[PDB]
Amino acid sequence: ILEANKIRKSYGNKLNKQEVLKGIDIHIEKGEFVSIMGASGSGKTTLLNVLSSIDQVSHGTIHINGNDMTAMKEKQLAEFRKQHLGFIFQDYNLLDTLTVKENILLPLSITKLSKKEANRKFEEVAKELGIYELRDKYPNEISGGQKQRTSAGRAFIHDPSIIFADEPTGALDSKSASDLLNKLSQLNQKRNATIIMVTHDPVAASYCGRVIFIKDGQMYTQLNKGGQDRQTFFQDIMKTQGVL
Amino acid sequence: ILEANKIRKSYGNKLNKQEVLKGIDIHIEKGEFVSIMGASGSGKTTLLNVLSSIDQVSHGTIHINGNDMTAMKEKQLAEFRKQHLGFIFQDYNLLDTLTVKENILLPLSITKLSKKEANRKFEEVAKELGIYELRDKYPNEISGGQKQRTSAGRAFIHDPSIIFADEPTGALDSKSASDLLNKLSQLNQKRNATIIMVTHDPVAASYCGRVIFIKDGQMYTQLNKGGQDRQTFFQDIMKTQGVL
Amino acid sequence: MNINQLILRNLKKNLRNYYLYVFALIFSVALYFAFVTLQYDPAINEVKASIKGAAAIKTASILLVAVVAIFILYANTIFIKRRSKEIGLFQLIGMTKHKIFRILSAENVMLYFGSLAIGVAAGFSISKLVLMILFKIVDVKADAKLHFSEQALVQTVIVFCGIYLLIMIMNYTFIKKQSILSLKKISFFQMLIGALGIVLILTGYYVSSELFGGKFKTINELFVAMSFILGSVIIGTFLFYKGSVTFISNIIRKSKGGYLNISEVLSLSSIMFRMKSNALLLTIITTVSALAIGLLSLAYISYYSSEKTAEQNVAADFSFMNEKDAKLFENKLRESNISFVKKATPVLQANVDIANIMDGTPKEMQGDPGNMQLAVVSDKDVKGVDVAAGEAVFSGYTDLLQKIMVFKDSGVIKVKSKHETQPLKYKGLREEFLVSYTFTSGGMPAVIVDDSLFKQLDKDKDPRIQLAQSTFIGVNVKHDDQMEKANELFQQVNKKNEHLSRLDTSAAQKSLFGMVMFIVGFLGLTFLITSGCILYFKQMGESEDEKPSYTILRKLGFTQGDLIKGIRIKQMYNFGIPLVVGLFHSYFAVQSGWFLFGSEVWAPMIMVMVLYTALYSIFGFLSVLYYKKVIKSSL
Amino acid sequence: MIKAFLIERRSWIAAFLFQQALMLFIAFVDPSISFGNVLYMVYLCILFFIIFLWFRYRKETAFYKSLKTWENNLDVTAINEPETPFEAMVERSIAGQTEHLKQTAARHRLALENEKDELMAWIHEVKTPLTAMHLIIDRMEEKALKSQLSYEWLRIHLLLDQQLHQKRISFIENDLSVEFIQLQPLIFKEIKDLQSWCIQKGIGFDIQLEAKEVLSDAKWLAFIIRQLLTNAVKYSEASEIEIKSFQKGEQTQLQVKDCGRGIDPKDVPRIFDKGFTSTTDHHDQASTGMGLYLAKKAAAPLLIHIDVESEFGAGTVFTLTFPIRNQFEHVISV
Amino acid sequence: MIKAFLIERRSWIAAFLFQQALMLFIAFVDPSISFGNVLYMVYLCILFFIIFLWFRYRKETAFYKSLKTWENNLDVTAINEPETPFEAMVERSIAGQTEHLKQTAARHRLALENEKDELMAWIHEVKTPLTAMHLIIDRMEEKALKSQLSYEWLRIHLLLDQQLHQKRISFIENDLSVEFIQLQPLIFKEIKDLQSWCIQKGIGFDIQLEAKEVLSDAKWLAFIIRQLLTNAVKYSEASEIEIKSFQKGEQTQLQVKDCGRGIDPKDVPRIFDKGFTSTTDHHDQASTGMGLYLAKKAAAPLLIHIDVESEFGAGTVFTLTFPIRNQFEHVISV
Ligand SMILES: CCCCCCCC/C=C\CCCCCCCC(=O)O[C@H](COC(=O)CCCCCCCCCCCCCCC)COP(=O)(O)OCCN
Ligand SMILES: CCCCCCCC/C=C\CCCCCCCC(=O)O[C@H](COC(=O)CCCCCCCCCCCCCCC)COP(=O)(O)OCCN
Ligand SMILES: CCCCCCCC/C=C\CCCCCCCC(=O)O
Ligand SMILES: CCCCCCCCCCCCCCCC(=O)O
């Protein structure tokens, strides 16, 4: 799906100019679980900006299903990201006044579509994620893990193709993070969807299948996993990150 | 110290009942380092929760240091779990608006040990875990491994009876994990204190004295180690796990 | 989905959280309606005073609307900032920027206009109460009746509609601006700014100590000193919050060792970092509170003088200038069945030198020290003292003088006559006045000389500074009895208001300072409510940023009954510092000029500070009720 | 609930209004206090009292509405958190009642478990003398009396083993297992057990099993097979049994055809009912009749379809449809 | 007591004080109002309000006071009859919960009784093939095979009769009856019943009955004879069983003594307990040991006492102490 080539992010505020991204060629195909990882001060937020189109792009040649974002306008970009892209944020954002069910059904309640299909979709998502029993509760009377799972499931109801994700462990302990990561990995297999994260937690990066390392841009030395035991891979990731 | 007599626990949501304890009653005396392990969906974590004051026991009787604590109110139970039952959690659970010395001394502000005795006890604890060089540095400056040692030092300052450890060596490398486990074993050797620990790593469990393989809420034998070589016990537990 | 029902839920949720805002809105509308109704009441003209009358409420309204508008604008620019996590979400779902504005301008207009409608309804039943309160301080009788005064509704509606228009303009200016889907150790300067601020405040207070002392005495040299004092005080107050609190907190922290309990760790965590950000608001709060308290205290101190100065300015109950008018008024009193003990005394004006009796500095000149014009009286007329030749006794206290004209003990007193000068010595100082202030210039005392020396002084009769009338024609009164009829007889005798009466100078000053205190008190109450609400509206954010901290601490065995105990001290430390600084400011500002209004302090200041402290600590009590709610839901 | 609140506190309001009325009366009757300056006081006090009552109603009438909302249906914790001292005692009483009910239920369950254990021990000490009587009985030499004692040995076996199926079906749901099964050894074992009785009745076995492998559980399908065979035989006398298995499409089907009396059409639908016994023949009284319903209730989770072709005077054809092998991949893989 | 009432009603005393303060202030700030009269009215109202508060507390705080003690009181009707809806609410909730608890307990007990009923019924339809086997066993000729089959029949028959009598010993209370019984003929038929066991084991017997008449239930006295005789026979081999009946004092005693291997001295007093079985030999593991305890339990309603005198290697003496005839004078009268 995604072939990110020549990652260029321009700068030059006042007089100082920085090449935080110095041109990177990136290859993913259908159904991967790639996550790029660096260190502090490597511009992970700028990685979101260049990748997730949160802000206006500067340069580069990157296409989504062959659709380049650099030959296409701002409002068209908003429509493209709203009808073709999804996001998951570091801190969950759920309206307190609404209910758990209403929060997930909100994105589909703006296109004037039939009610029965929406009910069936919510049924399927809730059953497959495990929050079905909480159909009439409020976000003020449930724990953090359930809230984060609901936030993650909110982005899996508008018929998505690619769902971005910043670090989904900032406001979670180990148990909730492990449950969420296992559920997301299972969702990757049941319905085919590519998930890209950039996190600072090696534990959260051990779940992946292709990890990319950066220091200032083009540096690679990526790993492959393939048939690892899921723990030696974690040790190797930690050792490589410490050395580099 | 810890004698268990047919502890029951059924996980239910008032409509569907799922029992997870199937005839567990453990006999534990003073001054022994044990380990509980087995499978992934087993109730060993639930067993550790129900043994402590975290979870209520459905049916059975428990005895901690001679006291019978099942049928007693919440206030005195909280007092018990405060002045006994030290804890080491999966995550660090440290404060960022304090230093290390204040973090490992705040839970002692309930008894008012004056200042000289508290300083002497803190020095004694710190010089054994090798953190006395970091008395006045904020937690966001030290490595990840040293935070686990700081948490252990906090947990080992008021001298509790049973130490419900829960997978400490989960997010470390080889060297820091080995050093931390060696320090824990040495401190157990010096100070008489029962430590109950749950882990998934064979090298982690090699340092223990006894290993209990709970499988679907059943005993299923138990090792005894003894005056044997560490490596021999390591391959013994490897082949025992391979049998499973 | 269900836009209207979602808006209704949001409106109810907003109404549940922000109720002090509604209370403040209704209270402000009530006071504005009350003052505007009071201004146009035809009975307001009964307030006879030196001031215009109903032209002061026109100042009270215009000075009140500014505070109300400022409070409302700041509250509405605080409210919208806490709703970005929803604006971003609505922007990413697909709703444009022209629908979010209608979403968030329908959960506010109903609340605002309902509060406005309630305020007008409840301002009708307090106008009579306000009028009755006013016609008790000025001591006038009236027939205050209830009426609607349709003129006030237009003013209120126009003013608040304009304020709402400004609010909408400001809100629209923010939504489509900050968007684009965007969801420590001390330093050397920080170790000097605190000391600089503390020393600046201390030296400002020290300079404020002297003022009208022995130094700086010039008609233009006081203004520069006062401006310097105000500037230094304001700058020091600003620098206090931005650097000095950090220094003291750092010392207290690195003085306990390492054994910090729960209360100290909950207290020091907030006010070492959060107080630094808010350094432009606490200064305003403290200065305005100090100003209000000081002005109120003086306005109550001058009420005690409104009685003593009226008793003392005229020695008797009446004073008369013209012999014919006095004799005809006595003729009228003759059939009035009034037994008047009349006493008269010729008065002479002579100049003397008292430069040798002042223990201060020649800067305290107040004229030529060798040519002070004083009032000299005979000894036979005075029925209380029998002085001899070569001895003079001063009369009167005049609290101003003891702090201004310092007088020595018996030295040498020279009399500046035409061709002679006798040495005299200071025997003592009297307290009562035997001469009205008209004959003795501004506040100069009167001297007593021997009758024998009077027979030469009157014979000499230096014709240079003598007054037009050399007499103290004044009618006294019998034992305490009815006086009002004699009062209107006195007014109908004198249509040229050139005689002075004891019971008439006691009314204009009382009325003037009563109006001053009325205005100042109501304005101070309004500012108290405003500051309380504003300071309460930041603790919500400060507590919802400290919610994770509670959750972590709760996994280590701590119970809610201890977290609440720590919060009960954190709130006190948050709400105490501005009040204490304001109290110190007020006490160090009042004492500089207490001896310029009345002769009694420590009476009003204690009452004012106690009332302010209670009405300000109500809001401090009204915050643990939200902290407990935050703690309970942090499992 | 406004009426209930107004009725409940029907003394404080009356006292306040009586005080206001007394003040108004003393002001009105005595020509010494202006009557225009007391109505304002009454008005202000009435306004404040009305506002206070409106603000107090909501904060007071919550617990005694939540209690009725919960009632006795479910959600015992739906009651609101007690705040005032009075409601704390009510909450404590309710909690005590619930705890006592829980204790009673636990005691009842324990007693039921103990009696089940006792009856199962009785089952064990019946099953061991079963082996004893088997080994002793299989030592005698006669022929006709041998067949006699043989089929009663199997008769006791039937009811007593069915009791084991009953006690097992009490918890059957936790014993699922799917793997390939060969039916021919099962059929041969059933024949060997029923050799003497079938020989006495002169029933030949026409076994031609075209199909070789089936995918289900062994024990309960074996029980179903013996139960269906016994039923088909007891609806028959001196007739040959045709055992036919064919791979009908993707599913295996056992078509067992006999030449028995059959079932009358008016009573065909009622054979599968609980407690049904055929009244045509007095020899069927010995049949318990619990086997068919137990087989039906055990085969519902097994997804088993049974097709009956019973003709009066011609025989009864029972066809059981094995579930397709691919249908159990969702049970094995998932 | 008073403290809770005050701390709950603190919201109305404040309103009363605010009303008084507002009235006093408005009266003070007016030119046409007498301040002293208003002060007098305030004082009088304060006094009357204090008296009213005393009465209100005393009348009000009774229902919650009673239900507070009710939570652990032995009785259940301690709750006073409600007079206020806010208390009738709690009364209704508590009554509903209690009746639900009672209905649930009754349903559970009824279900247990029913399932026991089907168990004993099935025991009867298993009993019928048992008498079929008895007939077929009576029909052989070979001495050894007939003896072995009769012995096994008798063992299994006595086991299942013991179990059925254990089922009915739960409600033996419903069929109590006392009548005169002759001992010698009953003992003769009972000895004839145990013929196969003594034939196989070659166990002799001795009969010495000085007393001939006793007072008990015929079926239950026969079952006591069965219990004691079968226990002695299974615990003795090739020994003469000396039975003696005599009147000791006012009570008739049936002393039966065997000459078997005896019981170990450490285990002598534990015979009457549940599950007591021999452990010296591996052949005795399957034994039950239930008969002695049930005989002891149901010995009380028949007022029959059991005494044991056991010696290891010598034998066991069992004494059946019948109660006094004059002791039945009280029983018949009641
Ligand atoms: C000069 C003339 C002065 C007149 C002053 C009159 C002002 C008082 C009048 C009306 C108050 C209107 C604004 C407050 C009402 C909004 C609060 C409210 O209703 O919230 C509802 C419940 O009430 C509350 O929780 C808040 C309780 C506050 C009681 C009223 C407090 C207002 C005045 C107290 C302020 C005291 C400050 C005094 C400082 C001088 C909704 O909450 P809920 O959780 O959804 O529960 C629903 C129940 N089933
Ligand atoms: C920032 C500090 C806030 C403190 C509270 C400010 C409240 C604003 C209101 C009124 C300002 C009053 C100034 C202080 C009162 C001066 C005391 C004084 O002058 O002494 C005497 C007291 O008379 C008065 O001044 C009237 C005092 C009434 C003020 C009541 C205090 C609370 C005011 C709140 C009223 C508004 C609330 C309306 C709704 C309840 C005057 O002489 P007299 O004893 O009455 O005898 C007359 C003939 N025998
Ligand atoms: C500054 C003026 C103060 C007086 C305002 C007079 C208006 C009072 C209006 C009604 C108050 C109702 C609020 C009481 C809430 C319940 C009391 C409580 O819970 O403690
Ligand atoms: C006489 C002036 C002072 C009056 C002080 C009392 C005013 C009411 C104080 C409490 C109001 C809020 C009560 C409920 C708050 C909540 O539950 O959030």
How many helices of chain D in DSSP terms?
11
State the distance separating the first and last CA atoms of chain D: 55 Å
Order of helices and strands of chain D: HHHHHHEHHEEHEEHEEH
Order of helices and strands of chain A: EEEHEEHEHHHEHEHEH
CATH superfamily of chain A: P-loop containing nucleotide triphosphate hydrolases
| Helix share bin of chain A | 25-40%
User: What Rg of chain D is obtained from the alpha carbons, in whole angstroms?
Assistant: 39 Å
Name of the level-1 CATH class of chain A: Alpha Beta
Largest contact between chains: D-E, 72 and 66 residues
Find the CATH topology of the domain at 156-333 in chain D. Heat Shock Protein 90
The tally of domains of chain A stands at: 1
> What portion of residues of chain D belong to β-strands?
5-15%
Query: In one word, what is the shape of chain D?
Result: elongated
Q: How big is the Rg of chain A?
A: 19 Å
- The CATH architecture of chain A would be 3-Layer(aba) Sandwich
| Ligand roster | the ligand CCCCCCCC/C=C\CCCCCCCC(=O)O[C@H](COC(=O)CCCCCCCCCCCCCCC)COP(=O)(O)OCCN, oleic acid, palmitic acid
Major pleated sheet of chain A: 4 strands, antiparallel
Helix segment count of chain A? 8
PDB class: membrane protein
Keywords: ABC transporter, histidine kinase, antimicrobial, membrane protein
Assembly: pentameric
Entry title: BceAB-S nucleotide free BceS state 1
Give the SSE layout.
The complex is a heteropentamer, with two copies of chain A (244 residues), one copy of chain C (635 residues) and two copies of chain D (334 residues).
Chain A: E1 2-5, E2 26-27, E3 35-37, H1 44-52, E4 61-64, E5 67-68, H2 74-84, E6 85-86, H3 100-105, H4 115-129, H5 144-154, E7 162-165, H6 174-190, E8 194-197, H7 202-206, E9 211-213, H8 232-243
Parallel strand pairs in A: 3-9, 6-7, 7-8
Antiparallel strand pairs in A: 1-2, 1-4, 4-5
Helix pairs in contact in A: 5-6
Chain C: H1 3-17, H2 20-39, H3 57-79, H4 84-93, H5 97-103, H6 109-121, H7 127-137, H8 151-175, H9 190-210, H10 221-253, H11 262-270, H12 274-277, H13 282-313, E1 318-319, H14 323-334, E2 348-353, E3 372-377, E4 391-395, H15 399-404, E5 413-415, E6 423-429, E7 446-448, H16 451-460, H17 484-493, E8 500-501, H18 505-544, H19 547-554, H20 560-590, H21 604-621, H22 624-632
Parallel strand pairs in C: 3-7, 4-6
Antiparallel strand pairs in C: 1-8, 2-3, 2-5, 4-7, 5-6
Chain D: H1 2-8, H2 12-29, H3 39-60, H4 63-70, H5 85-137, H6 144-169, E1 179-181, H7 183-193, H8 195-201, E2 205-209, E3 214-216, H9 219-234, E4 241-248, E5 251-257, H10 290-299, E6 305-311, E7 315-321, H11 329-332
Parallel strand pairs in D: 2-4
Antiparallel strand pairs in D: 1-3, 4-5, 5-7, 6-7
